[PDB]
Amino acid sequence: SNRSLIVTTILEEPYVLFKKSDKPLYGNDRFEGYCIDLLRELSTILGFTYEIRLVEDGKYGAQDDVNGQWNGMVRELIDHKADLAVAPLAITYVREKVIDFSKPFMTLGISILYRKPNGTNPGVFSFLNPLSPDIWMYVLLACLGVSCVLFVIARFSPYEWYNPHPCNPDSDVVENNFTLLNSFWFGVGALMQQGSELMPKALSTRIVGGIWWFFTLIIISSYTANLAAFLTVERMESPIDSADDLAKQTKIEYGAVEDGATMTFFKKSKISTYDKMWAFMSSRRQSVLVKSNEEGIQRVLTSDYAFLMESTTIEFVTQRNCNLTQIGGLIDSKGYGVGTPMGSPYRDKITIAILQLQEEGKLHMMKEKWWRGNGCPEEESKEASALGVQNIGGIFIVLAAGLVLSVFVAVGEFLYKSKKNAQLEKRSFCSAMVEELRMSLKCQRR
Amino acid sequence: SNRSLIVTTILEEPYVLFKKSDKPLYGNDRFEGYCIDLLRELSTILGFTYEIRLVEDGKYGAQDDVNGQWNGMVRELIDHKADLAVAPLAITYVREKVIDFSKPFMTLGISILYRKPNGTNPGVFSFLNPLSPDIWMYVLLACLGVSCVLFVIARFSPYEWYNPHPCNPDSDVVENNFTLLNSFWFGVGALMQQGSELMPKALSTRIVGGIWWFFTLIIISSYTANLAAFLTVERMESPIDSADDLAKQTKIEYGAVEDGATMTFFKKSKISTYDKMWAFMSSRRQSVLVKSNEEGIQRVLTSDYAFLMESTTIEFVTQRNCNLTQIGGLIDSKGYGVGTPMGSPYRDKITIAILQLQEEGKLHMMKEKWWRGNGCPEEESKEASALGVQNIGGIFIVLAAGLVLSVFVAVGEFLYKSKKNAQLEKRSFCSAMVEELRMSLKCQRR
Amino acid sequence: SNRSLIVTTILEEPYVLFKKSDKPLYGNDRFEGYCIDLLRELSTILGFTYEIRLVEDGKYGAQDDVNGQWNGMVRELIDHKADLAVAPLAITYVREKVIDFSKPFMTLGISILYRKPNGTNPGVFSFLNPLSPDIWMYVLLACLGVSCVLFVIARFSPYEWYNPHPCNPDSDVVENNFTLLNSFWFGVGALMQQGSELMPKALSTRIVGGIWWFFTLIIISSYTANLAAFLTVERMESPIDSADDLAKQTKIEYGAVEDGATMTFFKKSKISTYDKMWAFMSSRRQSVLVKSNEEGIQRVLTSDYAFLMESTTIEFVTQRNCNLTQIGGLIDSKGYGVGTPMGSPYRDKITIAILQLQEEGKLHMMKEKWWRGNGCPEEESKEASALGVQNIGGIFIVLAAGLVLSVFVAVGEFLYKSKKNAQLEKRSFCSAMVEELRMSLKCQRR
Amino acid sequence: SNRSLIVTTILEEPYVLFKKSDKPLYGNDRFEGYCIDLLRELSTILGFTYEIRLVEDGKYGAQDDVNGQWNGMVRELIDHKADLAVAPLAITYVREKVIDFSKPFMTLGISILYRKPNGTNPGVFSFLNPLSPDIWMYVLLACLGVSCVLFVIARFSPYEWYNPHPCNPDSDVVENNFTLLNSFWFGVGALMQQGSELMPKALSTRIVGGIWWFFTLIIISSYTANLAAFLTVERMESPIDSADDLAKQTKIEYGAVEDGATMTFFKKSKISTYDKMWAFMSSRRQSVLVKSNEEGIQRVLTSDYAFLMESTTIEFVTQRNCNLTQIGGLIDSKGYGVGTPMGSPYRDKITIAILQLQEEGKLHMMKEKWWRGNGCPEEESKEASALGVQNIGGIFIVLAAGLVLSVFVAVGEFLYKSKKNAQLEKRSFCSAMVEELRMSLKCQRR
Numbered sequence A, B, C, D: 001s002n003r004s005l006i007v008t009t010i011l012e013e014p015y016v017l018f019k020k021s022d023k024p025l026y027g028n029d030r031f032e033g034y035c036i037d038l039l040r041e042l043s044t045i046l047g048f049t050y051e052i053r054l055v056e057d058g059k060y061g062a063q064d065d066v067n068g069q070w071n072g073m074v075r076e077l078i079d080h081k082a083d084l085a086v087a088p089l090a091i092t093y094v095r096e097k098v099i100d101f102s103k104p105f106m107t108l109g110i111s112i113l114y115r116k117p118n119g120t121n122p123g124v125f126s127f128l129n130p131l132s133p134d135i136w137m138y139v140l141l142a143c144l145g146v147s148c149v150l151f152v153i154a155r156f157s158p159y160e161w162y163n164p165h166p167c168n169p170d171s172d173v174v175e176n177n178f179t180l181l182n183s184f185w186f187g188v189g190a191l192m193q194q195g196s197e198l199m200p201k202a203l204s205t206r207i208v209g210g211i212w213w214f215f216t217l218i219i220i221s222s223y224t225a226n227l228a229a230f231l232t233v234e235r236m237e238s239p240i241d242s243a244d245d246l247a248k249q250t251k252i253e254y255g256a257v258e259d260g261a262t263m264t265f266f267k268k269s270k271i272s273t274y275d276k277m278w279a280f281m282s283s284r285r286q287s288v289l290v291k292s293n294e295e296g297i298q299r300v301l302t303s304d305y306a307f308l309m310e311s312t313t314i315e316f317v318t319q320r321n322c323n324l325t326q327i328g329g330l331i332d333s334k335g336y337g338v339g340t341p342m343g344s345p346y347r348d349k350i351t352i353a354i355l356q357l358q359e360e361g362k363l364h365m366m367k368e369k370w371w372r373g374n375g376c377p378e379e380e381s382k383e384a385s386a387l388g389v390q391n392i393g394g395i396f397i398v399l400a401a402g403l404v405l406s407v408f409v410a411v412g413e414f415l416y417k418s419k420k421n422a423q424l425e426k427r428s429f430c431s432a433m434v435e436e437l438r439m440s441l442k443c444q445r446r
């Protein structure tokens, strides 16, 4: 006998698919998928003929309170029109009574879907983060302002106007140090904690030094302390890693398909978490609470949703929307299972198969083929802890900018000297080149 | 099967909210909340029906006035126009004289509502917090210490006495570089880490400077390590922590409703703290007494104010917003209780009901239901803040303080020696113009 | 009529007490307490005669499953031997059926008892905490070791042995700087980040400088970083402040009296916390699970227990064992209530009293008298955040120790000079005193 | 009322623990745990009695050997000496061929057990972590940068050329203090903040040193801020994170039980990673295969090892101790299931039972019961550690590294110039003894 063992199916992608091609019939070759390749191996060992038949109305099905009158693949079966049923069916309490299931061939579970953490893009000039945008300006104003005072005070101070009485003292000349540019030098050097050569000696100049030196120490120790906070706090941040983490978070908000066995567990929950979580479900039962998985994928993209879903469909989209990720552990336990009529001469024959193919490893091999594919951009790390270029970075651009300006002035130094010198001395450029290569004089002489 | 049971009630959150849907009237589904959930478990354990009724005056109820009549739900409960009154009725003397309440289903006290600390203006100082004021003075005292001691040691020491003679040998002249003033300079300059000349010599000084330098480092490192911690972990404190703390203060105003529960108490109260506050409250009985609880909330948010109501409404307002909190504990004690006409057995019938329903745990479960909301805990590590004008401004102030002090001493210096010129020099204002125009030479020579 | 309204009582301290004195009868004056002073006021307003009578067997009482046959003050009442019952009785489900209670006169609750946080005793030398006890020794070994090398290297280095060619060069003498003591000076100064005067010039001496300067920077920046951790983490520590905090803590362990209405709530709990908490109760049901309150006080003293108790007895012992404290909020709700027989002509007369005395405030006034007393050592703060002497402290002792040693050497300097000088020069002490007061020479001359 | 029901069972935690009390035997109270709690809810929903039975061989059961007989509970379940077998029996092919299991009450996989990271030997370095290796090389490169550039700028600049003439005016000799070697010194010395002479001059140099000093501060402050964070927040990582990661390694040995569930799989497995490991495991089939799971645990604790068992026993061992953890996920998939003789209806009768009992939620509740223990989470902020020899030792190593490098260059210097003596001086070893004994003068003069 054949009977075709009238086998019900349901389009879900990956489990079964229309063949992706041209030409006609493909009769029982039309459908190609996991369940197809499973069915194949069921056929090899027990032996039978398979005529695929999509169910009508396309339903997993359930006992609808109106009349019961199961609405789907359960229905083609219970009336014994159907035979074996090889599709996502999700063993349950209520379905088991009326129709007896095989033993599982897959272990799914409820878990959360969320977008991957994008990155930081610190803004390579992150070093200039820990204080305001405004304070750095005023610190710059102060070094000019204070330095302007050192010039005025020191110059006007009779206790400055010391003498450059050398190592050989007892001559008589005065020669201040605190000219203008050297005044800024005291400011910039103190501000960077390396002490310049020039120093106050008269009290007035010493007071201003003593206070700038205070003005420095607080800014720097505060710069150090902020940056330790920004870095420590960042290090101290964990992403969400559980329903409990999401439970305490009235930020990134929940999501779920309408009843779809997902609300079902939550309504009938007794977990304090999943009881609390349900509160928000009911709360925004117009917004989040979507009515399809395809939207729930689309929705997490646009925004900060966390769609609850069976783990199998997580795995597929994760590996095909690498923007996105699984999170958490398997919340619940369930498992798909090939359907059989009320107690029949196949359930105990179809079950030994599933155990047989298991030991040989064909299922997990089959698990890879359909769900796995092109190697995702998995390459990604969070070793960010140790700082790198993207963290600090900019200071090297600041370094480069510095060295460049020194060149341009150093050229400017050359021109100004020889020109002003040549004004009272020889013509113009005779000086320039003889002065150029006498800087070169292969020794420190002249 | 008798009279259903006429339940009188008033609309007031989170007890009696007008049910939210368009889906027109349904009687026993025109209302929900806690007051309705209590009736459910009440009518479940017992057996009866509601239908429901409402007020026709708004008022909870009170001994009316000179008429000595009764308004509110106490009206309705006297002349048998109704029966049970699950509603926020507060058990009091005058009420119990004319009706008979049930036993409490919930406790209640008078407490405080204040704008939560936000620590968004610590002060234009608070670079100075990270060490105790006790320390900041002791260290300045120690700078005066070692400067005074370095002066003693160095001088009495023979080896400190170099002889300059840099350029040359002989010329047995002697010098002592450390003066008293020069000794501060080492002390102050070392403490701010910029370092100075007057590098010691002659071992007796070198122990001193070494231990000082060790004294410098620990203080700065300790200052730095703490400003890190205060800016990592914000233990944001609160101004007051009680009625007593609130009582002694006058910057903050008390607040209370008007002609009501809270107001009545403090008038009739006879405790010190609570008599003192009726005075302040009586003093301006036009601007610390709002005429509605909603506006009472407002005064806290916009102005500085600390409203006094019942503990339960606070807990509601507390959760919904995020900036309002329960400063202190429970001053008074009261209890809501289900109304009942005089003599009616429905008192004792409910009396066992509420006792029973608690031992189960439902009132607490019901409590968690309708009072909890968003749950707003944020506490998101205090996403670290760019240090700015507020958190440090005084370092700019001590700066401009010292700069002005430098000008005044500098003009001071100018006059002092210009008159010590006059000792050997000519009269007085000669030396003035001489040295004033000594600055007007405008070069690096005399 | 009188009847004495036979009033039952139970020795508990504070509620009722034997009078503390000599001479006999004191007939109904014997007992003195809260309930006594309450009863007093009940008598003033309703009017009656009171004959105290301690119950026999001394029991709150309960329906013992053996025979029911209530075992206590409930028993003297239900048989109508007794009358009013003014004592701690704790309104409940089961007691209410058989005997009808008045309305509460006290609002107790379950809460936790724990010892106060003692302190820190940081060990005043806490500055020397952040690194090991061992590393500081080796850093000290290194400054001697490295300095020993600078002497050897520099002295043996022909590029050192420069000339003290002064400001007037072109003479011919050599005069190293890096003698021994100045070598240590380079070490100690570099280690404290202030740069000494002496500097390497020859490469060999420059390499060792460059590496010590690295050896410094890591130690100090690590000293800073550890100390920021020890301080931050301490700041980041909260004490326990809830049953949930204690729930997550398999450290400081639970405690409770045997059944005593405390286990009762926990067994019949449905809170995930109080269900989890019960797990450990049952677990160590021989150790913690004490059989009396007096032990439970004694036990928390000895060790790290957290005895669960009704709030009233918390309040008393807290204010009389100031070592100890209340913690958490009221977990449960209950409330004492004067007992009355099955429905009787007093419950509705005794209840208006309790409400009457409330409004006048006599209860809370009475609440103070017995529970309050001698002002506890309440003076206590946790403003520890800003560091003070106890935190750092020691460095000032280190400072003092430094200055002292400098004196002793500075004396040693004086003796060594004049003696060695006087050896080739005048006698012994003629030099000493003429040298003493010529250091004084009121100017820097000689 | 029929046969009670003979339940065969094996003692194995946390399922079947011999009940703990002295209180001698009670049949149905000789045993408790999960296996017994399941029977409870099983016999409750159903109706029957246990009495109970045990094994008489110890073994769970297996196809015996050459005899082809059956031991264990599979013996007892064949020849109707018993009935249901609530016990940790694992559903497999050979078992299901001769009996008929129920449907799973729990899932199960093969996974890994490894000694939890303790981060108690980060390394004798890890003062070098807080910035990326990418950075530590770039900054040294920049020191070579600015030293080389300062050399260029300074020299070509006219104004850098001071003329010493300190003691005196004229003598128009010129100097250039910045050599190439002296330019490193500024660079290196500035970077370690000790500061140096060669303080620049002549503006073109001053921009360079300023930007360098700004480059110094950010790096040190960033280093300091991070070593704070790494020592505040210990994100202690793990060596491996999978079988693949474990597979490529050989420092760590795999581990597995022996002649059993786990071992059988990897032999019969045909996946790359799992074929590679049978090789290593086969290679030494005498020291990576313990002969008991208890000793298997041990090898992880004492030695370095990574044991392979079933996921459930791991979760048990995981909670009880605190140092053992579940590295990775679930390799295989299995499921425990209640035994039943062939054809018996008690399979399908229980089948609805387990489905029902889950939808309630009890199996999860039962799961939380007997697997959770102490719950050991400690994570007590990582009570901060006195930095020591481990966390920093390399700073002492780079020190002793450089000191040895200084001696070798120093002797290098000695020879080099001693032979540049010989140019003008006499032969070779003359200058040796001259300068060797030049050190033996033993004073500060030639």
Ligand SMILES: CCCCCCCC/C=C/CCCCCCCC(=O)O[C@@H](COC(=O)CCCCCCCCCCCCCCC)COP(=O)([O-])OCC[N+](C)(C)C
Residues within 6 Å of the ligand: A439, A440, A441, A442, A443, A444, A445, D148, D149, D152, D176, D179, D180, D181
């Ligand atoms: C980034 C790559 C460039 C690297 C720089 C290139 C190398 C720079 C040089 C390196 C050698 C070592 C440092 C300088 C000399 C040593 C000082 C001394 O002891 O005496 C010297 C005094 O001379 C000086 O002090 C200055 C020397 C430079 C003079 C003129 C510039 C030409 C150098 C090129 C600049 C190009 C600029 C590039 C333009 C694009 C005299 O030396 P001597 O009489 O010969 O014998 C003793 C010298 N001994 C120490 C070897 C024993």
Ligand SMILES: CCCCCCCC/C=C/CCCCCCCC(=O)O[C@@H](COC(=O)CCCCCCCCCCCCCCC)COP(=O)([O-])OCC[N+](C)(C)C
Residues within 6 Å of the ligand: B148, B149, B152, B179, B180, B181, C439, C440, C441, C442, C443, C444, C445
């Ligand atoms: C802790 C409490 C002790 C405080 C110290 C006590 C006060 C110390 C003094 C303070 C005055 C200010 C500083 C020193 C003098 C100023 C320098 C100068 O310009 O010329 C002076 C050079 O003299 C010196 O440089 C050294 C002076 C001390 C010489 C001998 C020690 C006696 C001082 C006592 C030590 C006791 C040690 C204690 C023993 C237990 C010459 O001064 P003049 O020729 O007179 O006129 C110019 C001076 N004018 C600047 C005022 C205009």
Ligand SMILES: CC(C)CCC[C@@H](C)[C@H]1CC[C@H]2[C@@H]3CC=C4C[C@@H](O)CC[C@]4(C)[C@H]3CC[C@]12C
Residues within 6 Å of the ligand: A138, A141, A142, A145, A146, B124, B389, B393, B396, B397, B399, B400, B403
């Ligand atoms: C010191 C001399 C050279 C002037 C330099 C400019 C500095 C000192 C000026 C410019 C901007 C100023 C600040 C502008 C605004 C505020 C906010 C105010 O609520 C307190 C003062 C404070 C914080 C000012 C303090 C002084 C300040 C920082």
Ligand SMILES: CC(C)CCC[C@@H](C)[C@H]1CC[C@H]2[C@@H]3CC=C4C[C@@H](O)CC[C@]4(C)[C@H]3CC[C@]12C
Residues within 6 Å of the ligand: C138, C141, C142, C145, C146, D124, D389, D393, D396, D397, D399, D400, D403
């Ligand atoms: C540098 C010269 C002067 C010697 C000074 C002594 C210093 C450098 C010595 C004394 C103690 C030594 C340490 C003793 C123990 C250990 C632990 C070992 O697992 C690595 C080496 C290490 C960390 C040593 C490194 C060098 C050390 C720090």
Ligand SMILES: CC(C)CCC[C@@H](C)[C@H]1CC[C@H]2[C@@H]3CC=C4C[C@@H](O)CC[C@]4(C)[C@H]3CC[C@]12C
Residues within 6 Å of the ligand: C159, C203, D179, D181, D409, D412, D413, D416
């Ligand atoms: C690899 C080792 C052995 C050799 C490296 C060369 C070093 C050690 C030596 C060789 C000759 C030396 C130079 C020769 C003379 C002088 C002049 C002096 O006023 C300053 C130092 C200076 C400029 C020396 C600097 C260091 C120097 C460059």
Ligand SMILES: O=S1(=O)NCN(C2CC2)c2ccc(F)cc21
Residues within 6 Å of the ligand: B103, B104, B105, B106, B107, B335, B354, B355, B358, B363, C091, C092, C104, C105, C106, C107, C108, C333, C334, C335, C336
């Ligand atoms: O004797 S009771 O009416 N029974 C329980 N209730 C409450 C539900 C809060 C309370 C709360 C406080 C009381 F003082 C008494 C009672």
Ligand SMILES: O=S1(=O)NCN(C2CC2)c2ccc(F)cc21
Residues within 6 Å of the ligand: B091, B092, B104, B106, B107, B108, B333, B334, B335, B336, C103, C104, C105, C106, C107, C354, C355, C358, C363
């Ligand atoms: O309205 S009551 O029955 N009588 C007054 N009190 C008392 C503070 C004793 C309380 C305290 C709490 C209540 F819930 C009820 C009452």
Ligand SMILES: O=S1(=O)NCN(C2CC2)c2ccc(F)cc21
Residues within 6 Å of the ligand: A091, A092, A104, A105, A106, A107, A108, A333, A334, A335, A336, D103, D104, D105, D106, D107, D335, D354, D355, D358, D363
């Ligand atoms: O269809 S089931 O027998 N019913 C539920 N169970 C579990 C209790 C874990 C599981 C767990 C994993 C499955 F694959 C199937 C089932």
Ligand SMILES: O=S1(=O)NCN(C2CC2)c2ccc(F)cc21
Residues within 6 Å of the ligand: A103, A104, A105, A106, A107, A354, A355, A358, A363, D091, D092, D104, D106, D107, D108, D333, D334, D335, D336
């Ligand atoms: O012994 S089974 O009924 N058949 C084999 N399978 C798997 C498909 C993996 C599983 C997976 C998990 C189970 F709990 C049971 C089974």
Ligand SMILES: OC[C@H]1OC[C@@H](O)[C@@H](O)[C@@H]1O
Residues within 6 Å of the ligand: D302
């Ligand atoms: O048995 C405990 C283990 O830990 C200590 C170490 O010395 C090992 O040799 C030892 O075996």
